[PDB]
């Protein structure tokens, strides 16, 4: 298919992301959090960005393929380099830093959250990732792992996704135009299902907006999508890139995608 995408390098596009952020009502406080790790990032990493082709220098860039191609290893190399005490921010804490306030969590989260410690660790050392004490433990008993029953049933597993969110007390703010898309992989080997991929949808009069940190020492992406069908073919083949896995379970808030 064609991806139509932004990876904010340009005051320009980020002025256009902030009024879209500020229109769906997210914080403008976050906002600038949000657009301040951006720049903050694209500096770090200018002089390896500037060398992939497909990165745009000034508004929207177009590619012919599932996912769009990133200097992956080179990027985490400087990452390392230059922050070696701690982890760049990822697609949790990003989708969380944008939406945090649009989900309700009223149950501290005492169960096994071993898949978030590095998530935990950005939290308490990143100034990118500072949060609340309130909205630490929500985010522990949003993003901790989900148990399973090892059903390849994607149905059945998004309704115990569901099931598992409601016995949390976890529930999504309503009549609103932003959602979250969360991709979660199924581990049978710990009995649970995880979020793997996350990222923020709003829809526009162009279509749907999606943004998401592609991944930790990754770069931000923001995608022009036709339709939400395209949305979550994009998190299947984000999924996807990583011989015999299971298919992944695309939820959008609580509901399969
Ligand atoms: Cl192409
Ligand atoms: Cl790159
Ligand atoms: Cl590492
Ligand atoms: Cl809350
Ligand atoms: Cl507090
Ligand atoms: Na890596």
């Given at each position: ?148 029953k090892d059903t390849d049933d994607t149905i059945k ?101």
């Open positions: 298919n064609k991806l139509i995408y932004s990876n904010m390098i340009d005051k320009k596009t980020q002025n256009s992301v902030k009024e879209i952020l500020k229109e769906n009502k997210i914080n403008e406080k976050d906002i600038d959090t949000f657009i301040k790790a951006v720049n903050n990032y694209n500096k770090l990493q200018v002089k390896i960005l500037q060398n992939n082709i497909n990165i745009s220098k000034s508004g929207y860039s177009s590619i012919n393929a599932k996912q769009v191609p990133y200097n992956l290893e080179k990027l985490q190399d400087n990452w390392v380099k230059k922050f070696p005490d701690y982890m760049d921010v990822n697609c949790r804490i990003t989708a969380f830093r944008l939406f945090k306030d649009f989900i309700n969590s009223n149950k501290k989260f005492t169960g096994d959250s071993i898949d978030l410690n590095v998530d935990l660790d950005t939290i308490m050392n990143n100034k990118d990732a500072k949060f609340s004490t309130k909205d630490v433990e929500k985010f522990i008993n949003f993003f901790s792992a989900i148990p399973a597993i998004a309704e115990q996704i569901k099931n598992e969110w409601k016995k949390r007390k976890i529930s999504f703010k309503n009549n609103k135009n932003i959602y979250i898309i969360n991709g979660f992989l199924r581990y049978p080997e710990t009995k649970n299902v995880f979020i793997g991929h996350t990222g923020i949808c709003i829809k526009t009069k162009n279509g749907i907006l999606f943004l998401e940190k592609y991944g930790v020492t990754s770069p931000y992406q923001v995608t022009k999508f036709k339709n939400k069908e395209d949305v979550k073919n994009y998190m299947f083949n984000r999924l996807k890139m990583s011989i015999e896995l299971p298919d992944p379970i695309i939820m959008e808030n609580d509901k399969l995608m």
